[PDB]
Structure formats: structure tokens, C-alpha cells
Design an enzyme around this catalytic site. Structure first.
Site: not given
Ligand SMILES: Nc1nc2cc(Br)ccc2o1
Lengths: 273, 8
Positions: A14, A135
Site C-alpha cells: 500500500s 538507513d
């Protein structure tokens, strides 16, 4: 041609991974993930081995995608008028490590050891290829549930690995090291080790230790779950406030807590199936 | 205790 070489399916996650869609390579029915990045939104650019101007993300992905590794590999890419399209591996079934930890809570140390080891090996692979991820966090790690293999994703905040100082950072602040918070300066390897300490605490405690700048630079690690003394020691060493006081990757992997790791298939059969 | 994702 993109649409003529891949069957494109619906959005993955999503939007939580970015603009990543499920796909199938028509030439062999291989499952792929198709990631779109908008040129207007790209802050950092690089040159391919042949001089072509592409997003840094593509540069880094290409550098780590040679051979097998614990990284989701770039299989192909395309340039469009306003975007770049990245064709990635899509293991199945998968759950990202953030959702896995949310659903299961703090992981058994045997499982955390196996996961953390695979993350260390994957980060070492990146560094050996000249790539700094910048990250590392549970959200950027996929678990192949059937094979027990972890895969690093999202090099969108990465950089070429260098031994000189970094003065820019666009990764996740609660995984970033105190010297970044305080001085906006860090070196790549010791900053990565800090983020790995945050990740290990996350695994054995069920959530990250620090939410605020004052906690990152404060230097106190409270353990909210039962964690072995050897594991606490490694975590606290990775989270040393001064970068030179942190272990190297060699010292992490030689740490007593890290010995006798499970193999990926053993990990799947014991903990994931 | 709330646990949340953090943006890059
Ligand atoms: N199953 C599956 N989910 C993925 C997310 C990204 Br981002 C890349 C590959 C993936 O494969």
C-alpha cells in the site's frame, strides 16, 4: 519496453515501500518487484560505470547486485521521461522485520542472533562493494519466511562508501548516531555500527531504545526485557557514544554473544515455519 | 507501549 516485458500487478504494501508494484517477468514468469522513483524527487545523482547519469539508488543497487547476497538485487532498470523504473527480486512469502517484531514481540536471542548475523554479513557485502546503506533499520529488512534469509532494501539514502567524513544524512533519525545529532558529522562504518546496535536492541527488546535526540546523545541504555549479559554488552558496545569506542564488524562477529549461529534453513525450520 | 515506524 516496460509494459511489454513485465506483467504489472497491484501496489505492494500500500505504498509503504514507495511506489513498488508486484510484477512477473514475462520471459520466464519470474516474480519481480517494480519500483518507480520520480526524477523531480531525486536529491542525489551518480554516474553508472559507463558514465550514464542515474539516481544514486541505481548506482548503489548495481554495485551490490552482483552475485548472491542478503540484498534484494536489481535485475534491470529503465528510464522514463519523468521517472526511473527498477526491477527487483521478489521473494515469496515475505514479511518485513518491523512487522515481524510488532507481531511476535521481542525475539528469542537464538533468533535475534541468526537475524543479526545475516544483517552483518549483508552490510559487510555492501561495504565490500563500495556502498554505504545509511538507513539500516527493521523496516528496511525483508524476511524470506520459507528460506530463513534476510534481505536489505531501500538504498535511497545511501552513498558511495568513503573513508572521509560525511556531512549529509537523509536516513532515519532515531537510528542515527550521536555525532550526527550533535555535530552533523560522522564516518560511515562507525555510524553503521551504531545503527546496528539500535537494530539489535530492537530485536531483543521489541522496540528501539531511543525516540528523542536527548536519549540518543545521553548514553544510557535501559533494557525493558530480559536480555543476556553477553547480548547487553554487545549492544552497549555498539552504542558507545564516541565512534572510536565502537567495535569493528570483525569485533562484533567475534563477540561471545554471536557464536554458534544457526544456518538460514535451520532458522526457518525452528522459528519461521 | 506504542511502537511506530519512522520516516527517512
Ligand atoms: N515480497 C516482496 N516484498 C518486497 C518489497 C520490496 Br521494496 C522489494 C522486494 C519485495 O518482495
Amino acid at each position: 519496453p516496460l509494459e511489454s516485458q513485465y506483467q504489472v500487478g497491484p501496489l505492494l504494501g500500500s505504498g509503504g515501500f514507495g511506489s513498488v508494484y508486484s510484477g512477473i517477468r514475462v520471459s520466464d514468469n519470474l516474480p519481480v518487484a517494480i519500483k518507480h522513483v520520480e526524477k523531480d524527487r531525486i536529491s542525489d545523482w551518480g554516474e553508472l560505470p559507463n558514465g550514464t547519469r542515474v539516481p544514486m539508488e541505481v548506482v548503489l543497487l548495481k554495485k551490490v547486485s552482483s552475485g548472491f547476497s542478503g540484498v534484494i538485487r536489481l535485475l534491470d532498470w529503465f528510464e522514463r521521461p519523468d521517472s526511473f523504473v527498477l526491477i527487483l527480486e521478489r521473494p515469496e512469502p515475505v514479511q518485513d522485520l518491523f512487522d515481524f517484531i510488532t507481531e511476535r514481540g521481542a525475539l528469542q536471542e537464538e533468533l535475534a542472533r541468526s537475524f543479526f548475523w545475516q544483517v552483518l554479513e549483508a552490510v559487510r557485502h555492501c561495504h565490500n562493494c563500495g556502498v554505504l546503506h545509511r538507513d539500516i533499520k527493521d523496516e528496511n529488512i525483508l524476511i524470506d519466511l520459507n528460506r530463513g534469509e534476510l534481505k536489505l532494501i531501500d538504498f535511497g539514502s545511501g552513498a558511495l562508501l568513503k573513508d572521509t567524513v560525511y556531512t549529509d544524512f537523509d536516513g532515519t533519525r532515531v537510528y542515527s548516531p550521536p555525532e550526527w545529532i550533535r555535530y552533523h558529522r560522522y564516518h560511515g562504518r562507525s555510524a553503521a555500527v551504531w545503527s546496528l546496535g539500535i537494530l539489535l536492541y530492537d530485536m531483543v527488546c521489541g522496540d528501539i531504545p531511543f525516540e528523542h535526540d536527548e536519549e540518543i546523545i545521553g548514553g544510557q541504555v535501559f533494557f525493558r526485557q530480559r536480555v543476556s549479559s553477553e547480548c547487553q554488552h554487545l549492544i552497549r558496545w555498539c552504542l558507545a557514544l564516541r565512534p572510536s569506542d565502537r567495535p569493528t564488524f570483525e569485533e562484533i562477529q567475534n563477540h561471545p554473544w554471536m557464536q554458534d549461529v544457526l544456518l538460514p534453513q535451520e532458522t526457518a525450520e525452528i522459528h519461521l515455519h | 507501549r506504542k511502537r511506530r515506524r519512522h520516516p527517512s
